[PDB]
Write a protein that binds this ligand. Structure first.
Ligand SMILES: Cc1ccc(-n2nc(C(C)(C)C)cc2NC(=O)Nc2nc(CCOCc3cccnc3)cs2)cc1
Ligand SMILES: CCCCCCCCO[C@@H]1O[C@H](CO)[C@@H](O)[C@H](O)[C@H]1O
Length: 337
């Protein structure tokens, strides 16, 4: 049976939700979009309901709506955001204009956990382990996050962590993304992890650049200027010439940057924050690293089913994206509680 819906004025608009979702009230001010906290009476969970803004206004909007819904429907891992529900008040394709996404209500992101303070080594181990476990899964589906940072990491009271993407902001970006490289390795995400880890250990931003060029300046100070093997890999003549014109600075001693840190943590950081992306440790390799001895379990670090990114990259008409999105809404099956 189709659930009974009720209507209510929220965020300047008329929301229409199934009655299982009780006591809607706006959260985040507006920083997560049009979102209300709610209580799901069916499951006994506090949830967040997001009303997608203008989902089918343009081809780009329609495409984004379909890409996010399809992707979130595919994500089924403890350390990655999942969808609790998705619904529309519409009874048919003809009147289909709104899409609501339902997730767990999240009380905190990683910054709310850190508060610019050092964490214990055991706590760092646990948090980084979970990020890497979630990344192994995401990367196995051939997906690159590309914007991993503390505000994209949800963390509950028992420090259980989920990777999401809400869509300063450059502090965790891989140098090759800063340089508009275009053939990104999955290890761009590993760079971000190294930056996050370093901050958890020290309670300070590793590379707090003031602007774009400063960010790169700070990075090079730690990891040194490119060696000969890396110089060989630069197709760009201008990039090649400029780096050749630079003054050679050696890699810093990480042990003398993270003073008093677990030497296993120092070792891992050295393997994450390598300028040459081809030489960075992968998510799977990082999980097997000794730093995570107390958490690593080879039999419970699952991979994803294959994910088709070509379907979302098509050039389709607005009503085609809308119909395909509608199908995704209708075929949705909630997770086992
Ligand atoms: C176009 C596009 C496509 C794919 C993505 N991706 N890619 C990923 C992964 C690659 C899987 C990481 C994840 C997303 N998307 C994603 O996380 N979306 C979210 N939507 C909400 C609902 C609103 O916040 C609720 C709330 C707010 C405050 C408190 N408590 C709850 C949460 S997380 C993004 C954009
Ligand atoms: C002056 C700053 C130099 C930064 C150089 C960053 C090099 C990143 O590393 C590069 O990543 C590319 C994109 O995935 C790969 O194609 C290359 O093989 C790899 O060497």
């Amino acid at each position: 049976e189709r659930p009974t819906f009720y209507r209510q004025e929220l965020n300047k608009t008329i929301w229409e939700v199934p009655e299982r979702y009780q006591n809607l009230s706006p959260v985040g001010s507006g920083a997560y979009g049009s979102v209300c906290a709610a209580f799901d009476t069916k499951t006994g969970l506090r949830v967040a309901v997001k009303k997608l803004s203008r989902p089918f206004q343009s081809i780009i909007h329609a495409k984004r709506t379909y890409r996010e819904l399809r992707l979130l429907k595919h994500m089924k891992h403890e350390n990655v955001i999942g969808l609790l529900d998705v619904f529309t008040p519409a009874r048919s394709l003809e009147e289909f204009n709104d899409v609501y996404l339902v997730t767990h209500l999240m009380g905190a992101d990683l910054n709310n956990i850190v508060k610019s303070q050092k964490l214990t080594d055991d706590h760092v181990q646990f948090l980084i382990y979970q990020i890497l476990r979630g990344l192994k899964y995401i990367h196995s589906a051939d997906i690159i996050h590309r914007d991993l940072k503390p505000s994209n990491l949800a963390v509950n009271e028992d420090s259980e962590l989920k990777i999401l993407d809400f869509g300063a902001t450059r502090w965790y970006r891989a140098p090759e993304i800063m340089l508009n490289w275009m053939h990104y390795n999955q290890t761009v995400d590993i760079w971000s992890v190294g930056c996050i880890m370093a901050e958890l250990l020290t309670g300070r931003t590793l590379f707090p650049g003031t602007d774009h060029i400063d960010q790169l300046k700070l990075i090079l100070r730690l990891v040194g200027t490119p060696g000969a093997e890396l110089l060989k890999k630069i197709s760009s003549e201008s990039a090649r010439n400029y780096i050749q014109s630079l003054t050679q600075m050696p890699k810093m001693n990480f042990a003398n940057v993270f003073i008093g840190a677990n030497p296993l943590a120092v070792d891992l950081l050295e393997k994450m924050l390598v300028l040459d992306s081809d030489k960075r440790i992968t998510a799977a390799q990082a999980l097997a690293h000794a730093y995570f001895a107390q958490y690593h379990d080879p039999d419970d670090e699952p991979v994803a089913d294959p994910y088709d990114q070509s379907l979302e990259s098509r050039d389709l008409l607005i009503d085609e994206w809308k119909s395909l999105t509608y199908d995704e809404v209708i075929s949705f099956v909630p997770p086992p509680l």
